Design an enzyme around this catalytic site. Sequence first.
Site, short mmCIF file in Angstrom:
data_model
loop_
_atom_site.label_atom_id
_atom_site.label_comp_id
_atom_site.label_asym_id
_atom_site.label_seq_id
_atom_site.Cartn_x
_atom_site.Cartn_y
_atom_site.Cartn_z
N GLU A 19 0.82 -1.23 0.00
CA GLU A 19 0.00 0.00 0.00
C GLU A 19 0.85 1.28 0.00
OE1 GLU A 19 -2.55 -1.34 3.32
OE2 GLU A 19 -4.27 -1.25 1.94
N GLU A 25 -4.50 -10.32 0.52
CA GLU A 25 -5.31 -10.15 1.73
C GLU A 25 -6.77 -10.41 1.39
OE1 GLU A 25 -4.58 -6.27 3.56
OE2 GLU A 25 -2.43 -6.41 3.11
#
EC number: 3.2.1.23
Lengths: 129, 1024
Positions: free
Chosen positions: B481, B550
């Site tokens: 991220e 994820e």
Amino acid sequence: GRGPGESYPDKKESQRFGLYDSKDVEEFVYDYPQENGNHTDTHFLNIKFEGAGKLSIFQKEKPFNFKISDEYGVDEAAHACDVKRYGRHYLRLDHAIHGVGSEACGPAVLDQYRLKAQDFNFEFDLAFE
Amino acid sequence: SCLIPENLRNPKKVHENRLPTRAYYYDQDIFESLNGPWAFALFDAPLDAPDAKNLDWETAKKWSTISVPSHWELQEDWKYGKPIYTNVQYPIPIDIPNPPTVNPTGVYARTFELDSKSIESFEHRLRFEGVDNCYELYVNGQYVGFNKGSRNGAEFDIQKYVSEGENLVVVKVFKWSDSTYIEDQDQWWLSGIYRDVSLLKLPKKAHIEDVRVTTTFVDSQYQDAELSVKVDVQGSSYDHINFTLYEPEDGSKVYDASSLLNEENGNTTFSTKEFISFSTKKNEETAFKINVKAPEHWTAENPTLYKYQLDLIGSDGSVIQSIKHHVGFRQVELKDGNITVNGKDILFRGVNRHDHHPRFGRAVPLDFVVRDLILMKKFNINAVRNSHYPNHPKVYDLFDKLGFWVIDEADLETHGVQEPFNRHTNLEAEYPDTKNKLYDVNAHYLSDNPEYEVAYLDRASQLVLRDVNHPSIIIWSLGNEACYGRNHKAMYKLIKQLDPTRLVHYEGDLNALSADIFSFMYPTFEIMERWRKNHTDENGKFEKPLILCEYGHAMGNGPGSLKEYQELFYKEKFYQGGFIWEWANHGIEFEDVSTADGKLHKAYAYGGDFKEEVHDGVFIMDGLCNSEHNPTPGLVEYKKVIEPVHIKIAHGSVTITNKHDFITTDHLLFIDKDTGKTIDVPSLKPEESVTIPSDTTYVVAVLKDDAGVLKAGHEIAWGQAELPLKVPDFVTETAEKAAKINDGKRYVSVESSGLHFILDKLLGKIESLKVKGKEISSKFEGSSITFWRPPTNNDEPRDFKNWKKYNIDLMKQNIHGVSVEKGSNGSLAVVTVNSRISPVVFYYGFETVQKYTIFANKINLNTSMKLTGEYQPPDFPRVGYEFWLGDSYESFEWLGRGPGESYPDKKESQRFGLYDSKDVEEFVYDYPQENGNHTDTHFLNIKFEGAGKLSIFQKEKPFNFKISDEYGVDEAAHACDVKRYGRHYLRLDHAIHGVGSEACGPAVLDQYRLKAQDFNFEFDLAFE
Ligand SMILES: [Mn+3]
Ligand SMILES: [Mn+3]
């Protein structure tokens, strides 16, 4: 100890024994600022700290006296609004206290209630939960 | 900015005088621990810290000590501050590249002894396994160097600085720097020397600096392989190198914590089962390539290893230095659009694992990491993602030996750049297919910032070069991220130059312009399917596959619908599985004041508990395991949905399918649970299946022998035939008994031999129902039928908002008419209650009819609930009765799902059977919420002391139930804040809302939502 209100050696019997919480009591404001807020014949005192439980305080073999407050400049404050206040509270933890009497007009504090000059010997425990 | 030191605000000052990264090998003869108590003092900012060029040991001796390794926010009495939890938001102002001026600075100091012979015999280095955030290093009052990269290692040459006798090491550690901007992982902010410190003594005239080991198959049938061993030797005084490869030890090898962690030794003979030997010649390249005949493959399902010993040899033929490690014969490729190991397109059965310990934080004892991995293996997990940084270097042998597919990930997260953007634009949601356009807006700050290229490359170089030789690592990840920019492209080029043998992952790179793999987090099935179709051509070919780095956010009660994700995984070659977030809750142990008790109790902290200015609350608690790293119902469910063998029982047949990638079913014992005798199952290859005729209901797949860290008899997979709902053979007393019916002004009594029924007509409340010594009564607050549940973490963002908005917690029963008639067909009496069940403020509600048909030993309760009125909710949490149980109550037993809790979209791991409440430790959530429901319940027996049982069953459908003690669950912050009644209650439910994963991921799926509708259901309360 004695409550819900204040109590003094010669002014205490109306204040029956029990377990009292400061949150349940409106502490009395005198029109003329003076000695106030003492609790006599105190068996034990629990002071609650946020997020950390209680500090228990007890005197050995005799009940004690205590006052928890905010205030100062009481001697010279002419009216309730003249009373000064600290940014934190204090505990006044007392072995003994003078009686109250009626000497402003009438008899002096009676003998058995006077805090006579003498040796002082007392033991306290500061028990942390 | 002269009030901030230059090195804490220079993105390019990645280090000063750090040695080049090399492959990590622990050697007892070279490594000397400097762990233990160090002099330590904490300062408000760099300018208050002493000049280390003038710091005596005589001065530092006088300081308090701290123990290395440890974080300074995790000391006795929080002496040096408390942990800070932020998820996305930076805990500092954003002024790239400046840290805050007030920057906690910790100075460490200790001494070590050096011999006369030592300085002559050895090259001396200091190796720091991890220090957060960065540090400058001093020896004997002389500056050695500087380092950034908290989860990376660092070595410094110390030879110039050392003296005979006492030597002084001083480390100045800083909490914040320009490096903070790229270390914004969703985790606790913790500082200090949190990993090992060592003094290295390398042989002086010549030593092994670095080793590269690769195994490449020569052929498309993956038989013969080339073993390439390249050694970097430093110094002149050596002759050649020897190399010995030993006979393989099969991956079924038995290990425990002790043998996995054994670090010995100098005089210890590594192995003697020689297989291949090679010697180099004097003055020739210290490298070689060997052809190896059909070696045993290394695989995560079978981590077969060849031990080896590499010897550096002097002129006199003596051994200067030895490396004892292992080789895993394995090749990873991108082949026909799939991540391929040894030609096989593998499936990730994975988790993200952070470094976390409830007391030590990121300073995790290896012992504890071992614990983690054993548990993973015990629950069918075959892969781990190092979210979001490399771990302690010793951990990777654990992966090698136990067998995990590993994604080793760069220490680089930039998430916080988005937070001001998110708030300024009032962004509600991010989606895996479109969110990259949002991150593109702010990439220029860091990931597309040229000033950070050196830093970004350093994170890559450090990641790869430390861990290159571990067969378990198959993918390098560029971080997490951090948006997408030129720096990521630069990282990709470098990693491919450094190590061509592995693939590169980076989720922030949607189109994988500089990655070999596609990756989504928390995607919807529709989004997965869009992507698949847009990347599969007309021929059915794809260039790259999709993983879920994820998914199935494991926060609290959940995750729901792991099942549906798995069905998708098996259906399409394009999907290669996922890694659920996360392995364990990040809770820190602390003393909590109880809301229930007023007293002090042990609890596990999340955001807010340490009184942070800014924090992200309970998002700390998002693991399959709790803060103490023990399984939750999440982990129990995951183990079942990912089981590598399918067992289907229908029509007098058991069908067994092997769902492993590599291994056979031979290691497994199949037991017919109905008879106890074993079933002869043919050896099944990956994807092969067999149908065996059988009358069985329940088949278990179990381990034949101790293998790896698993014990003989350990359950791998299981199946059951679906179980029809059978009405118990309870005999209702329909004989004619005289019964006194007293229909008063408010209360109605029905009395008979052994029976007492009292109903408050005003409330619709059962005051008392006592049949044959067994008593219940309604747990009544407004209504006899209730709808609320303490919101789960998943409920919070949306469903709870709806349920609160529609006052579902304030549902009221308003009685309209009560009808009392004498018994008919064996019946003692019939009491019928007509009412409206509706919340205050609202129109919507249920026109309700409750018919109580009373028999001598049974009470039939028919409930009819007609949904009426405008402005209705979409769904309810729950619907059913609440009953107080009598003082006699002691335990319960049920036929249905167990032994643990179960919910509509989280139930399949809980097989059918007869369960006893006494055999079950009911799960305690770290964050109190909806728990303890049992779905698909056939019947429930409640045992009363001295009076037998009350049997409860719903007509024609299985039901839901919870028996507990607890309340104040909604507002209890921790387990110790949960209040308890002086008696138990039964929550008896017709239906319950699913659980989903909406705290971060999809809403409860349609088929599991408790949609607003009419309710009609009939219960029997049968008294023994
Ligand atoms: Mn005045
Ligand atoms: Mn609490």
